[PDB]
């Protein structure tokens, strides 16, 4: 029997290496009547148009597989999706060649989309074995508000949760605004010095813009970004010293296609050796049924463990990802770009180059500034920590206790009344009580400083359900911490 | 601050060329990288190499095994080791020093080789 | 690494302005920018501009310069000449893997 395989391009060029790579591959294994052609078609502006070529293709032969590559552009995820939403329906595997958007990863929207890259939202091993190399072990997320980032802070969370250590905080910017420098003020002294970075070109231009209006960038801080914030006009402005990802050959499409051809005609070789098998119909206007040749092709493809090709083993997770992958951590030094180390899946093996830390010097900063100054919240109580206003000037009243000493006081910052919902101000006062002079002790022997306010809501604190949401979050002076 | 070019200086072909440059005003242990701009006569410029005081160095892909920068932390001083000088690229070689900031922006120059 | 063309056989009568212009052949110069040096006969070459909009600190306001990021090309523009400009005009830009130098140009 005569199975052939279809193909969309973005070249006349990749046409005749496929079909180079096709002559080639059937010249092999057996040859048990078997016999494959390669039916190839270019790219058109608007998708209906890449839906409609697509089901007449569909209708020319019946095509068991499809290999789809995103022409070089912007991301641009409009691209794919026609060839994914017109399969889809009839149930057949379609195979990605360059496309690196996390969004296809669901298997809700796409039932069958296999990806021979791994996606955007796959390099947090990558930052988390270097975090474990150079012992670091508080960060500071900054990922921007999108599907994208969604996906790889939920990674980085679960990764780090399984050590027991959750990121120090995660902050989250609305895409494509004009001025983020609050977040940044709010976040460059919390306590860490390593910040990871993953946001679109654009918004990364913002935040190098407003983090070198900062200050920031000099000595003492450790950036780790992604892919995308490293080529195009992200150099434009862009501190030196950062550590960015790239992959090894995520440009040279022949390799890529070479080892989709081989693994497919490998996967339908072995396919073919069975019983109850149907085809796929013919024509994209006459039956509207689910092609019986479905999961079963897709599960006989997930496994099939390739010894050594062009790029390496070749291994499919139960994710319709390629596993796998040769990343090369690169640094940046006065605009020019080197390589530094090799990741090959295992750990990371340092080159024979020195790396270049932020504001020059090489001495692998701790990443971590001891802040000795504390922020201490304390409720009102009758025994422990009274309230008392104070004095028209400003200073508390002097008290004796019977015995006669001179009860230790400290200045509170807290909202007067029971709430401030009506009026919204707040009156300094000052609290002694029980447990003040044990806290002035501590301070004492501890050898730092303090700088006590009240909580404004008043309550001890539970775990209180959100109003219509899945995320139950803390109330009160619980929840101030 | 101020870059004094120096050197032996060959004409000899087939040989190792060897030219060190001085610094006066400013010590080398300092952010700033240095650079050895060439410069062929009656014609344009072309970049050559860069060498930091850590040890790193960056050079051209055009002429990648062939010419070596090194410092010296001791005696503040930079040199240049072209090896299998040709007698078809005979030049002028300048040394300059640019700011680290985020651009490169090699100046001020030195008074420059003859060789 | 790409090519810079200029029009080396520009030269006007004093006390006119005139505008050079460097031109990228491959890519678009649009992320990193170009710096003018100016040479003077038996010197070393010299700054004149850099990041295209701001002079160094000490020279006069008379030379300008700007991009279109329309034609690949960077205009510097000088205005009232007088004796001193006759010197060797150059512009150098870089990709983010060497540096390049433009052909120069001068003005008599």
């Known amino acids: 029997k005569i199975v052939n395989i279809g193909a969309v391009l973005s070249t006349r060029k990749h046409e005749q290496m496929f079909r180079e790579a096709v002559n080639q591959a059937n010249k092999r294994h057996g040859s048990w009547k078997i016999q494959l052609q390669a039916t190839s078609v270019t790219h058109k502006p608007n998708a209906i148009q890449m839906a409609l070529s697509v089901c007449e293709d569909l209708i020319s032969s019946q095509v068991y597989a499809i290999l789809v590559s995103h022409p070089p552009t912007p991301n641009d995820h409009f691209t794919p999706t026609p060839v994914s939403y017109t399969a889809g329906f009839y149930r057949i595997p379609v195979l990605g060649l360059t496309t690196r958007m996390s969004i296809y990863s669901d298997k809700s929207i796409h039932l069958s989309f296999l990806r021979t890259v791994p996606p955007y939202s796959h390099q947090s091993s990558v930052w988390f074995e270097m975090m474990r190399v150079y012992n670091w072990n508080h960060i500071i997320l900054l990922v921007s508000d999108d599907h994208e980032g969604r996906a790889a802070q939920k990674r980085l969370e679960t990764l780090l949760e399984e050590r027991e250590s959750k990121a120090e905080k995660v902050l989250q910017f609305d895409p494509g605004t004009k001025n983020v420098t609050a977040l940044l003020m709010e976040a460059r002294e919390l306590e860490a010095r390593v910040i990871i970075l993953s946001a679109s070109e654009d918004d990364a231009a913002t935040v190098y813009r407003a983090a070198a209006m900062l200050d920031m960038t000099g000595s003492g801080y450790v950036w780790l970004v992604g892919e995308r914030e490293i080529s195009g006009n992200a150099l434009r402005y862009a501190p030196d010293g950062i550590i960015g990802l790239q992959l090894i050959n995520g440009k040279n499409e022949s390799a890529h296609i070479s080892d989709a051809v081989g693994v497919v005609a490998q996967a339908v070789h072995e396919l073919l050796e069975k019983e109850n098998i149907t085809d796929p119909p013919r024509g994209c206007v006459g039956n509207t049924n689910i092609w019986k040749t479905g999961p079963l092709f897709k599960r006989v493809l997930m496994s099939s463990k390739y010894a050594d090709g062009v790029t390496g083993r070749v291994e499919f997770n139960e994710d319709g990802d390629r596993k796998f992958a040769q990343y090369s951590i690169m640094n940046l030094q006065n605009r020019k770009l080197v390589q530094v180390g090799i990741y090959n899946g295992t750990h990371v093996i340092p080159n024979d180059r020195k790396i270049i830390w932020p504001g020059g010097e090489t001495e692998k900063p701790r990443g971590y500034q001891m802040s000795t100054r504390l922020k201490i919240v304390t409720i009102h109580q009758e025994p422990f920590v009274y309230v008392k206003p104070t004095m028209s000037d400003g200073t508390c009243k002097e008290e004796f206790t019977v015995n006669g000493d001179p009860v230790k006081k400290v200045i509170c910052t807290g909202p007067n009344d029971t709430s401030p919902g009506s009026p919204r101000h707040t009156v300094p006062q000052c609290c002694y009580g029980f447990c003040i002079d044990l806290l002035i002790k501590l301070a004492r022997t501890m050898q730092f400083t303090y700088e006590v306010h009240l909580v404004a809501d008043g309550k001890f604190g539970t775990q209180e359900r959100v109003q219509n949401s899945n995320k139950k979050e803390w109330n009160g002076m619980m929840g101030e911490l | 601050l101020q870059l004094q070019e120096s050197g032996p200086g060959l004409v000899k072909p087939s040989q190792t060329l060897s030219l060190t440059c001085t610094v006066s005003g400013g010590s080398i242990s300092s952010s700033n990288w240095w650079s050895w701009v060439r410069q062929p006569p009656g014609k344009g410029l072309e970049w050559i190499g860069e060498?930091?005081?850590?040890?790193?160095?960056n050079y051209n892909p055009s002429l990648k095994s062939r010419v070596t920068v090194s410092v010296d932390k001791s005696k503040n001083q930079f040199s240049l080791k072209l090896t299998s000088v040709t007698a078809a690229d005979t030049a002028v070689y300048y040394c300059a020093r640019d700011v680290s900031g985020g651009v490169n922006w090699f100046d001020p120059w030195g008074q420059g080789t003859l060789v | 690494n790409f090519m810079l063309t200029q029009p080396h056989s520009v030269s006007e009568s004093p006390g006119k302005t005139v505008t050079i212009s460097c031109t990228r052949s491959?890519?678009?110069?649009?992320?990193?920018?170009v710096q003018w040096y100016q040479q003077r006969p038996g010197s070393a070459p010299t700054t004149v501009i850099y990041?295209?909009?701001?002079?160094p600190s000490g020279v006069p306001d008379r030379f300008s310069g700007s991009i279109d990021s329309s034609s690949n090309s960077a205009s510097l523009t000088i205005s009232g000449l007088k004796t001193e400009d006759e010197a060797d005009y150059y512009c150098?830009?870089?990709?983010?893997?060497?540096?390049?130098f433009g052909g120069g140009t001068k003005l008599t």
């Open positions: 060498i930091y005081h850590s040890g790193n160095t």
């Open positions: 990041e295209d909009n701001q002079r």
């Open positions: 491959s890519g678009s110069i649009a992320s990193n920018y």
């Open positions: 150098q830009s870089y990709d983010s893997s060497t540096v390049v």
